[PDB]
Amino acid sequence: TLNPSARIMTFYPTMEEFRNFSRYIAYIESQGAHRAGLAKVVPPKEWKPRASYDDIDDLVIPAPIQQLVTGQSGLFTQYNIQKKAMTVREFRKIANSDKYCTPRYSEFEELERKYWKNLTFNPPIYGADVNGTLYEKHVDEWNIGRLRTILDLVEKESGITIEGVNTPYLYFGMWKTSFAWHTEDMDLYSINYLHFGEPKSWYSVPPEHGKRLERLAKGFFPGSAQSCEAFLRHKMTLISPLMLKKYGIPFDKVTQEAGEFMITFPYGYHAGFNHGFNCAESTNFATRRWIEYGKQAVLCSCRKDMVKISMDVFVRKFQPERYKLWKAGKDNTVIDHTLPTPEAAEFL
């Protein structure tokens, strides 16, 4: 019906559509965008999150990670080793230097090839997980610091703050820096804006096929699966498109350019890599449709202090008629990944 091919969709809102975030997410879901697990949203040309990016050179990256990768035949494991702090200024110099810079290429496929050929050599440094926002306090549209979604009920009612989830994160990339296959904490949505710099390429598995990817990864890494059910949440596992194709996992790819938003959808598996020096800002968010995902999310057991959000406030507020049953462990609801969020009543 709506995106029967489940391919990644791109959207081009007017400033008027840009004004209401939750509504536009509802709209693109009514168009089937969520079926791919990932979507691109290009803001109108007039919109800018900030006027200029040169006043940021003194911003500190407290905990850079060197990404060491081991593996073969399209299956890899990534070990992130923490490094001493540096500024953006210092990071740019290392990123744009001849050792870590993007190699020469004609078309994207070549660069993609070089990424999967070279990802275990010359480990790069990733400026990840930096608390902060590059938005300007007066930008009211699609502000990653305040999106006004129902996820706020974690802070506003329960008083809990979870860094990177209900607060913004910055990511300073260089060539070959990557993010492994994962869904979001509590299978939330995420939003990602590339502020400036070289592109970020993404891979995505449709939520309706997510279980097939999990079985695949379990088969490849049984030791890891025995130790933790949700081990993919460790964000250590890299699997090439050739392997996905070989084993019959549906997926799509898309490249994100400076000034573009990417939205990931509940239980969308995604992975990717940065083309060169860049800066991205990201956070999680939610809609009504997410509540059932949150209730059913399989979480990491093996590590201390992992992100676990109490679903109680959500069930209580948006599903009062199911609350008693849910508290009793008797809620048998099955998720249909193809369905849009209820907020799209008007659009359909």
């Binding site: 990840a128 997980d129 979870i162 860094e163 989830v165 904490d185 999680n284 202090d305 676990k308």
Partner: peptide
């Protein structure tokens, strides 16, 4: 608790 890469 925080988000980790």
């Amino acid at each position: 608790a925080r988000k980790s890469a």
